[PDB]
């Protein structure tokens, strides 16, 4: 007996099932505590039930609270559960409804309706006691098993007692620092059995290696605090406004795995950040000094895919691999052979959200993972950088009753995970999608954010697959986080910044599970989202399409690569269309910003469309826009440029193209986002998805001797289809930059950041300011192809119609020239003004940009090939 689950128990007194009018006259609910039911032979009824009860059809249908919470079942027929039913008892049983047509029940609705709980969860410490609280309303029994030590035998089991769906027990203070697991007896739909499950605590704050046991630690214990921890708020980098944010996206292992200036034993993890004089930390300091404000760290909570036990780690022979040819498939074969047992994974495989990853700690048992995480945050803050966590609330690594990697779904099966209309777990996020639409999932997400903000003094959060998270969850979290104060909680919540990837697809599209955290839905929330429009317009095509499809900054029309993309008029128009999209992005990607489009017609950002016919500009404020051309996913900036541009371009030319891309981000309105390595030409040898490609393909070289281009074809699983285009490029010596190119890229990246932070005009705080002050000057059907001219006005003259934002400059004009030749852009509207080359560029180590000039009589800005030139009018 293994029924599916097409019916829903939505409230205490209502069941929803999508059956006909006649079938609805003979529906009954059946329960068995021992899960002993079966179909009778004859198939004319259900057998082996403890109880059977008729469900009368509810003529009215489902009420508004239900259909609002579960829109996708809004047309289902409703069935009344009689008051005689003991609902608390039945939800602990195997349940079916039947009329022959038999099916199980999806219980989250009723579980929330009856057992939504706002009291203490996890471990609570008092002077004389420790208490444990676990929400498990469908469980038949819960005990706790204590171990002395991470590896020793069970010393004691203690029974918990349930009240209102929550199991609790109180013990003596000596329980502190024991290890434990819950023994949970609960009905698992996937096995149609009541099973004894050994599960960690969803509210865990520490763990033994691999989360095998939960450490009963008091997170407020003084010995877990680095020196001066409680004074960190006072030491944190000032942040006057979210409009001043720039973001640098970095993986913890990539940072220090190859860094010879860090002690061998401390490479790859949290402790590497404590080495202030390391090549890695000096690099971050250099960026921080230039203006960089935030470092976004890839997943650093307890995730699966890396063993916490370091003695199990495997490594390639780097000497041997370095001997292989640049376009060989031997390197990736060697990497792939041990990729399941190496120290490496991006970490998008969540197990327990509230605990630091053990593999990044010096010792995965005991306190090191806590103290060292704090030491990392403190160290970054002390070189002027705020810390953002990549949070992955949208899915779980594992589900079901078995395995070290399943926790949430062991305890309350079928509740923390989202399911389809047959009861099967939804997998669009990767696998085991969460259901933040359910009350205790929403609670756990918000509680977890608060844990990181308060216990670890984390400064911001990037939400992975934010479109899989309910908007209500996002906003409840935002308000909870930003109301934290130093007096009450030791952190200034007003400065905590939230952003995410609001992709809208699969089961959450069209608000089918509720209003989800999509790009369009988060407009007006003040929560940032990644602008994929500017990314794709600059680079060309998209990460799923033909890799050779060119864009504004990879030679579309201007420098064709030989891949057929239409006639000359078609490519010229496509280039101009991408330029429109970029300019909307450069002005904060706003709904209402008015641009003269490539046809000459004035259009709002929302009126310029993507291929799906959706607005390019979709935000209400520049702080809702995260502008980027690169991130951990897909090809690195250096790699996408190396693929899309004409093969005959020199590496020197490509280096200028890299700078153009990062400069478009760095001088944009909204919040610029950089992938770690943009600034040093980082390559993964064209790996399109390097999550499991090891240290070999993900190398971050802070000696600057290499950029990791030409270290073999990348791993076959994600890349083999494109090996034919990769091989000749990786093999060509002219594609590979030397140290000189890498250092040059870094110097110009530093300079463009200095420029951003030299004027408040690049960082306007509201849409009104952008609409009033930002103008583009190379527009319409006769625009000069390959040039964007962006002017930003400040108060000038006597009694001006705007506030003076800039004490040094009354006007800024930025010319982005992607043409492989000098251009002269005449802007007679800006004639007879006091424009000069920005002082940073006058003193640039790049000789080419110094040649940029302005002619007053004509308003002519002369800009060399493949250059971004910034002109200022001094006060």
Ligand X SMILES: OC[C@H]1O[C@H](OC[C@H]2O[C@H](O[C@H]3[C@H](O)[C@@H](O)[C@@H](O[C@H]4[C@H](O)[C@@H](O)[C@@H](OC[C@H]5O[C@H](O[C@H]6[C@H](O)[C@@H](O)[C@@H](O[C@H]7[C@H](O)[C@@H](O)[C@@H](O)O[C@@H]7CO)O[C@@H]6CO)[C@H](O)[C@@H](O)[C@@H]5O)O[C@@H]4CO)O[C@@H]3CO)[C@H](O)[C@@H](O)[C@@H]2O)[C@H](O)[C@@H](O)[C@@H]1O
Size of the site for ligand X (CB under 6 A): 23
User: Taking the complex as a whole, how short is the minimal distance between the CB of residue 543 and ligand X, in angstroms?
Assistant: 5
User: Taking the complex as a whole, how short is the minimal distance between the CB of residue 704 and Cl ion, in angstroms?
Assistant: 27
Q: Is 431 in the site for ligand X (CB under 6 A)?
A: yes
d(CA 23, CA 44): 14
Cβ proximity to Ca ion, 30 vs 344, nearer residue? 344
d(CA 369, CA 366): 8
633 binding partner (options Ca ion, ligand X, Cl ion, none; Cβ < 5 to 8 Å by kind): ligand X
Q: How many CB atoms lie within 10 A of CB 276?
A: 12
SS3 content of the chain, % helix, strand, coil (to 5): 30, 25, 45
Among 249, 426, 580, 689, binds ligand X (CB under 6 A): 689
The pair of structure tokens assigned to 422 is 């047959």
543 binding partner (options Ca ion, ligand X, Cl ion, none; Cβ < 5 to 8 Å by kind): ligand X
Question: Buried b vs exposed e over 595-626: b needs ≥16 C-beta within 10 Å?
Answer: bbbbeeeebbbbbbeeeeeebbbbbbbbbbbb
The candidate with the shortest Cα–Cα distance to 845, out of 757, 756, 705, 740, is 740
d(CA 89, CA 187): 13
Q: Is 339 annotated as belonging to a binding site?
A: yes
Q: Is 504 in the site for Ca ion (CB under 5 A)?
A: no
User: Taking the complex as a whole, how short is the minimal distance between the CB of residue 296 and ligand X, in angstroms?
Assistant: 11
Stretch binding ligand X (CB under 6 A), from 180-188, 231-239, 341-349, 518-526: 341-349
Which phi-psi region, left, alpha or beta, contains residue 271 (left: φ > 0; alpha: ψ -120 to 50)? Answer: alpha
The pair of structure tokens assigned to 779 is 């527009």
Q: Is 692 annotated as belonging to a binding site?
A: yes
Q: Is 384 annotated as belonging to a binding site?
A: yes
3-class DSSP state of 95: strand
Among 127, 612, 705, 798, binds ligand X (CB under 6 A): 612
Site residues (CB under 6 A) for ligand X, limited to 443-472: 464-465
Q: How many CB atoms lie within 10 A of CB 75?
A: 11
DSSP state of 339: T
Which residues have a Cβ under 8 Å from the Cβ of 7 and sit 6 or more positions away?
Answer: 15, 16, 17, 97, 103, 104, 105, 106
Cβ proximity to ligand X, 193 vs 428, nearer residue? 428
Q: Is 305 in the site for ligand X (CB under 6 A)?
A: yes
Q: Is 328 in the site for Cl ion (CB under 5 A)?
A: yes
Q: Is 532 in the site for ligand X (CB under 6 A)?
A: yes
Which residues have a Cβ under 8 Å from the Cβ of 613 and sit 6 or more positions away?
Answer: none
Find the DSSP H helices in 154-261: 232-235, 252-256
d(CA 715, CA 718): 6
Q: Is 348 in the site for ligand X (CB under 6 A)?
A: yes
Q: Is 732 in the site for Cl ion (CB under 5 A)?
A: no
Q: Is 344 in the site for Ca ion (CB under 5 A)?
A: yes
Q: Is 288 annotated as belonging to a binding site?
A: yes
d(CA 737, CA 650): 10
d(CA 389, CA 457): 11
Site residues (CB under 6 A) for ligand X, limited to 209-228: none
DSSP state of 422: T
Cβ proximity to ligand X, 349 vs 636, nearer residue? 349
Stretch binding ligand X (CB under 6 A), from 66-74, 500-508, 579-587, 862-870: 500-508
344 binding partner (options Cl ion, Ca ion, ligand X, none; Cβ < 5 to 8 Å by kind): Ca ion
Q: Is 342 in the site for Ca ion (CB under 5 A)?
A: yes
Among 325, 367, 384, 646, binds Cl ion (CB under 5 A): 325
689 binding partner (options Ca ion, ligand X, Cl ion, none; Cβ < 5 to 8 Å by kind): ligand X
464 binding partner (options ligand X, Cl ion, Ca ion, none; Cβ < 5 to 8 Å by kind): ligand X
Stretch binding ligand X (CB under 6 A), from 342-350, 620-628, 664-672, 855-863: 342-350
Helix axes 637-644, 651-666, angle to 10 degrees: 130
Largest CA distance in the chain: 97
β-partners of residue 868 are 816
Q: Is 430 in the site for ligand X (CB under 6 A)?
A: yes
Cα distances from 525 to residues 568, 628, 765, in angstroms, run 42, 20, 15
348 binding partner (options Cl ion, ligand X, Ca ion, none; Cβ < 5 to 8 Å by kind): ligand X
Q: Is 343 in the site for ligand X (CB under 6 A)?
A: no
342 binding partner (options ligand X, Cl ion, Ca ion, none; Cβ < 5 to 8 Å by kind): Ca ion
Which residues have a Cβ under 8 Å from the Cβ of 343 and sit 6 or more positions away?
Answer: 253, 257, 268, 306, 310, 313, 359, 695
Q: Is 810 annotated as belonging to a binding site?
A: no
Q: Is 581 annotated as belonging to a binding site?
A: no
Q: How many helices (H) and strands (E) does the chain have?
A: 23, 39
d(CA 749, CA 638): 14
Q: Is 349 in the site for Ca ion (CB under 5 A)?
A: no
Cβ proximity to Ca ion, 301 vs 303, nearer residue? 303
d(CA 596, CA 602): 4
Q: How many CB atoms lie within 10 A of CB 227?
A: 8
Which residues have a Cβ under 8 Å from the Cβ of 632 and sit 6 or more positions away?
Answer: 249, 251, 298, 346, 675, 690
249 binding partner (options Cl ion, ligand X, Ca ion, none; Cβ < 5 to 8 Å by kind): none
C-beta separation of 852 from 869 below 8 A = yes
Give the x-and-dash track for 681-710 against Ca ion (CB under 5 A): -----------x------------------
Cβ proximity to ligand X, 688 vs 699, nearer residue? 688
Helix axes 279-290, 739-756, angle to 10 degrees: 40
Among 505, 602, 832, 845, binds ligand X (CB under 6 A): 505
Residue 402 CA, chain-centre distance (Å), reads 28
328 binding partner (options ligand X, Ca ion, Cl ion, none; Cβ < 5 to 8 Å by kind): Cl ion
Stretch binding Cl ion (CB under 5 A), from 171-179, 303-311, 323-331, 786-794: 323-331
The pair of structure tokens assigned to 500 is 């995410």
User: Taking the complex as a whole, how short is the minimal distance between the CB of residue 600 and ligand X, in angstroms?
Assistant: 27
325 binding partner (options Cl ion, ligand X, Ca ion, none; Cβ < 5 to 8 Å by kind): Cl ion
d(CA 581, CA 538): 9
User: Taking the complex as a whole, how short is the minimal distance between the CB of residue 448 and Ca ion, in angstroms?
Assistant: 25
431 binding partner (options Cl ion, Ca ion, ligand X, none; Cβ < 5 to 8 Å by kind): ligand X
User: Taking the complex as a whole, how short is the minimal distance between the CB of residue 327 and Cl ion, in angstroms?
Assistant: 5
C-beta separation of 72 from 513 below 8 A = yes
Cβ proximity to Cl ion, 82 vs 728, nearer residue? 728
d(CA 156, CA 481): 39
Cβ proximity to Cl ion, 229 vs 324, nearer residue? 324
Give the x-and-dash track for 791-820 against ligand X (CB under 6 A): ------------------------------
C-beta separation of 161 from 139 below 8 A = no
User: Taking the complex as a whole, how short is the minimal distance between the CB of residue 694 and Ca ion, in angstroms?
Assistant: 6
* Residues contributing to the site for Cl ion (CB under 5 A): 325, 328
The binding site for Ca(2+) consists of: 288, 292, 339, 342, 344, 384, 692
* Residues contributing to the site for ligand X (CB under 6 A): 305, 340, 346, 348-349, 429-431, 464-465, 501, 503, 505, 532, 542-544, 611-612, 633-634, 689, 691
* Residues contributing to the site for Ca ion (CB under 5 A): 339, 342, 344-345, 692
The binding site consists of: 288, 292, 339, 342, 344, 384, 692
């Amino acid at each position: 007996f293994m029924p599916d689950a097409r019916a829903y128990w939505v409230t205490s007194d209502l069941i929803a099932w999508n059956v006909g009018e006649l079938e609805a006259q003979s529906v009954c609910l059946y329960a068995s505590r021992a899960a002993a039911m079966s179909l009778s032979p004859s198939n004319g009824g259900i057998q082996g039930y403890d109880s059977k009860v008729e469900l009368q059809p509810e003529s009215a249908g489902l009420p508004e609270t239900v259909t609002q919470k579960f829109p996708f079942i809004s047309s289902y027929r409703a069935f009344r559960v009689p008051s005689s039913v003991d609902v608390a008892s039945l939800v602990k049983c195997q349940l079916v409804v039947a009329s022959v047509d038999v099916t199980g029940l999806q219980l989250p609705g009723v579980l929330d309706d009856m057992f939504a709980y706002t009291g203490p969860l996890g471990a609570v410490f008092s002077e004389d006691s420790v208490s444990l609280h676990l929400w498990a309303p469908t469980a038949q029994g819960v005990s706790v098993c204590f171990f002395d030590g991470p590896a020793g035998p069970a010393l004691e089991t203690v029974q918990l007692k349930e009240s209102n769906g929550v199991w609790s027990v109180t013990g003596p203070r000596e329980w502190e620092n024991r290890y434990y697991l819950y023994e949970v007896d609960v009905y698992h739909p996937t096995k149609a059995q009541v099973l004894k499950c050994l599960a960690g605590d969803p509210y865990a704050r520490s763990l033994s290696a691999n989360g095998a046991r939960t450490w009963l630690v008091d997170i407020n214990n003084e010995t877990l605090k680095p020196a001066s921890w409680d004074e960190l708020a006072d030491e944190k980098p000032k942040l006057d406004s979210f409009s001043d944010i720039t973001i640098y996206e970095l993986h913890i292992r990539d940072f220090s795995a190859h860094d010879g200036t860090v002690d061998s034993d401390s490479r790859g993890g949290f402790r590497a950040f404590a080495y202030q004089a390391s090549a890695g930390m000096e690099h971050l300091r250099k960026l921080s000094d230039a203006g960089l404000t935030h470092v976004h760290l890839l997943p650093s909570f307890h995730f699966a895919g890396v063993d916490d036990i370091k003695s199990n780690w495997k490594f390639v022979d780097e000497c041997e691999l370095a001997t292989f040819p640049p376009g060989s498939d031997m390197q990736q074969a060697a990497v792939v052979a041990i990729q399941e047992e190496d120290p490496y994974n991006w970490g998008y495989n969540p197990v327990l959200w509230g605990v630091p990853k053990g593999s990044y700690a010096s010792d995965p048992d005991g306190p090191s993972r806590i103290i060292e995480y704090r030491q990392m945050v403190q160290a970054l803050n002390r070189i002027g950088l705020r810390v953002v966590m990549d949070v992955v609330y949208n899915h779980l690594d594992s589900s079901g009753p078995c395995g070290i990697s399943s926790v949430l779904d062991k305890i309350v099966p079928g509740y923390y995970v989202r399911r389809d209309t047959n009861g099967q777990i939804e997998n669009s996020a990767a696998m085991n999608n969460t259901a933040s639409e359910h009350f205790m999932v929403d609670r756990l997400i918000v509680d977890d954010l608060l844990n990181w903000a308060v216990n670890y003094k984390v400064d911001g959060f990037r939400f992975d697959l934010m479109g899989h998270i309910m908007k209500r969850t996002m906003m409840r979290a935002k308000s909870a986080l930003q109301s934290l104060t130093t007096d009450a909680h030791g952190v200034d919540g007003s400065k905590i910044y939230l952003y995410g990837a609001g992709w809208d697809f699969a089961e959450v599209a069209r608000n089918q599970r509720g209003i989800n955290g999509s790009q369009l839905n988060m407009s007006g929330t003040g929560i940032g989202s990644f602008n994929d429009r500017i990314r794709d317009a600059i680079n060309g095509g998209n990460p799923f399409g033909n890799p050779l499809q060119q864009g504004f900054n990879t030679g579309l029309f201007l420098e064709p690569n030989g891949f057929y993309q239409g006639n000359e008029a078609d490519t010229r128009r496509s280039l101009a269309t991408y330029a429109d999209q970029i300019q909307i992005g450069l002005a904060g990607n706003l709904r209402d910003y008015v641009l003269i489009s490539h046809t000459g017609e004035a259009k709002k950002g929302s009126e310029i469309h993507t291929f799906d016919g959706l607005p390019v500009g979709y935000t209400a404020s520049p702080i809702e826009t995260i502008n980027y051309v690169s991130a951990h996913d897909n090809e690195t900036l250096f790699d996408v440029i190396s693929v899309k541009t004409p093969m005959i371009l020199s590496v020197d030319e490509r280096c200028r193209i890299n700078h153009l891309a990062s400069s478009m981000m760095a001088l944009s309105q909204g919040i610029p986002f950089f992938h770690a390595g943009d600034e040093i030409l980082r390559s993964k040898s064209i790996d399109r998805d390097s999550y499991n490609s090891g240290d070999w393909f993900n190398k971050l070289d802070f000696t600057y001797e290499t950029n990791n281009w030409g270290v073999g074809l990348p791993p076959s699983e994600k890349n083999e289809d494109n090996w034919p285009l990769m091989k000749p490029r990786l093999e060509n010596p002219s594609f590979k930059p030397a140290k000189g190119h890498i250092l040059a890229a870094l110097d110009s990246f530093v300079d463009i950041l200095k420029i951003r932070y030299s004027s408040p005009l690049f960082r306007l705080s509201t849409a009104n300011d952008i609409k009033q002050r930002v103008r583009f000057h190379n527009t319409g059907p006769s625009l000069v192809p390959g040039v964007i001219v962006m002017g930003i006005e400040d108060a000038r003259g006597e009694s001006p119609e705007m506030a003076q934002l800039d004490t040094n400059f009354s006007y800024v004009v930025t010319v982005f020239n992607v043409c492989p030749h000098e251009v002269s852009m005449d802007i007679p509207a800006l004639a007879s003004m006091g424009f000069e080359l920005h002082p940073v560029q006058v003193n640039s180590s790049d000789t080419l940009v110094r040649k940029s000039a302005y002619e007053a009589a004509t308003g002519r800005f002369t800009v060399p090939g493949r250059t971004v030139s910034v002109f200022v009018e001094p006060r």
